[PDB]
Amino acid sequence: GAMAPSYRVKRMDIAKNDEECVVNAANPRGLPGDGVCKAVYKKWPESFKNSATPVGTAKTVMCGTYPVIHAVGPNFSNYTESEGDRELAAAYREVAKEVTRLGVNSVAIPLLSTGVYSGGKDRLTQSLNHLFTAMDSTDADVVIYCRDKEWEKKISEAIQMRT
Numbered sequence: 001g002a003m004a005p006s007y008r009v010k011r012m013d014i015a016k017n018d019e020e021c022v023v024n025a026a027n028p029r030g031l032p033g034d035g036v037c038k039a040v041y042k043k044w045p046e047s048f049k050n051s052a053t054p055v056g057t058a059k060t061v062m063c064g065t066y067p068v069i070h071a072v073g074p075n076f077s078n079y080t081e082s083e084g085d086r087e088l089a090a091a092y093r094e095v096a097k098e099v100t101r102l103g104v105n106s107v108a109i110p111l112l113s114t115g116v117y118s119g120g121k122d123r124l125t126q127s128l129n130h131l132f133t134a135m136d137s138t139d140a141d142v143v144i145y146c147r148d149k150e151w152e153k154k155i156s157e158a159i160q161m162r163t
């Protein structure tokens with residue numbers, strides 16, 4: 001655990017993170033995918049051996065000794081708002097279990113279901129709040145990675161609001 005567990009946000013490629021492990025915004029089939037998933041595939045391709053896992057779950061695969069936590073959020077194109085919300089909350093609880101099990105002091109995490117799985121909706125607040133709900137009881141330093149300057153500001157504001 002970190003001495004004073006924190007949340008931070010950075011606007012950069014999660015493939016360049018400075019944390020002890022990474023959460024992939026994975027697809028259920030362990031495919032290279034698009035966006036964060038493709039960057040993770042390019043950086044840690046070894047971590048996609050038997051990484052396939054159901055929606056609402058997380059499966060960790062080691063790239064050397066570096067843990068890649070494959071977290072499968074729902075594709076809101078396919079799920080109802082209600083069932084999608086439940087699966088998105090569940091994927092983050094599974095991430096918290098994995099981070100805890102690994103005993104890491106830090107984790108790099110993207111906002112699940114906010115890109116091509118968003119179903120064309122802004123889900124920053126929905127995804128971030130599920131991340132907080134899962135990770136608040138962990139003592140890892142959490143570093144949220146995003147690519148948009150306005151999302152960076154909104155995530156930074158949400159973190160600071162609670163401090």
Ligand SMILES: [Cl-]
Binds near residue numbers: 011012013016
């Ligand atoms: Cl970058």
Ligand SMILES: [Cl-]
Binds near residue numbers: 113118
């Ligand atoms: Cl996504």
Ligand SMILES: [Cl-]
Binds near residue numbers: 146147148151
């Ligand atoms: Cl973003």
